[PDB]
């Protein structure tokens with residue numbers, strides 16, 4: 155099955171076991187992404203992964219790809235990782251009022267699972283995740299995704315200033331053009347807040 | 360060159376919109392993120408270039424348990440309230456100050472009054488008066504800042520952009 159880090163101690167333990175000896179250029183590429191992912195990801199989504207449209211992003215995107223495509227840059231274990239998203243992840247016809255007074259709109263929810271449940275998709279941008287469920291504010295956001303990441307999947311773990319401008323996020327960065335299958339889209343009640351959240355189970359292929 | 364800023368304050372007091380507008384996006388009308396993703400701000404003050412990593416937080420009490428994960432190694436705190444919410448100002452000394460002083464001991468604080476555009480807004484005046492309140496006056500913000508030992512007090516409007524660059528300039532001066 156998949157490893158799940160439940161606390162700081164487990165996440166740090168697992169972190170130390172991950173590859174960290176990137177080159178200066180590779181670290182700067184990874185760290186640059188963490189400063190603001192928007193110019194990478196928006197450009198990649200807008201141009202369907204074609205780089206020639208803008209020489210400046212082409213160069214940055216190829217440098218990051220190289221760091222993440224490196225031989226050692228991969229996950230040893232099966233591991234579960236997490237991210238939160240706003241409702242428009244499912245399309246610009248949705249916004250965050252889909253949750254009203256801690257309740258998910260059932261009509262809109264059913265349209266979303268009708269459209270995306272069971273869907274295999276390729277992400278043109280990179281995928282930022284955390285190995286800790288609490289480590290973003292992914293519990294705050296309307297949509298929470300669990301990615302089941304199989305051993306050998308390429309990526310970079312970042313939790314220190316040489317690799318990220320935001321240390322303490324326990325980040326696992328996955329390469330661009332990652333293919334995943336949405337296994338399940340469902341609703342769950344947070345026990346602490348007592349509000350509904352849309353939950354997504356995706357498997358990295 | 361590299362510093363860390365964390366922004367805190369009551370739910371809905373304008374934290375995320377302030378970060379978004381500082382990033383030079385338009386004020387968000389339809390698609391309002393709950394928490395803004397990673398964004399390092401490039402700021403120059405007094406001949407020094409700074410890369411200020413901005414950490415957004417969820418202000419609601421429901422997420423109190425999560426917020427401490429944002430606090431370590433912070434160089435400056437933006438502690439916010441809304442000028443249209445005297446209640447949000449009262450939570451400055453009651454909630455935010457004790458929290459920040461516990462997790463970020465002796466880290467500089469900028470006290471920030473958000474939604475300055477609502478001070479001279481009729482709807483705001485009329486709604487507030489129904490509960491015998493009025494918009495926070497600048498003097499009251501200043502007094503609170505003195506009372507909590509803030510570096511300074513700033514007012515801004517994400518909606519109009521008024522004061523937004525000045526907030527982040529002062530934060531950078533406090534971070535240095």
Ligand SMILES: Nc1nc2c(ncn2[C@@H]2O[C@H](COP(=O)(O)OP(=O)(O)OP(O)(O)=S)[C@@H](O)[C@H]2O)c(=O)[nH]1
Pocket residue numbers: 368369370371372373374375376377387391392393394416417418419473474475476477515516517518519
């Ligand atoms: N009039 C006015 N309204 C604003 C301003 N900034 C934010 N708002 C409004 O206040 C509301 C909440 O702002 P937001 O930035 O989402 O608060 P927050 O502090 O991030 O709230 P949270 O994520 O801890 S629950 C939004 O509806 C937004 O339009 C402002 O400068 N002026």
Ligand SMILES: [Mg+2]
Pocket residue numbers: 374375376392393394395415416417
């Ligand atoms: Mg917010």
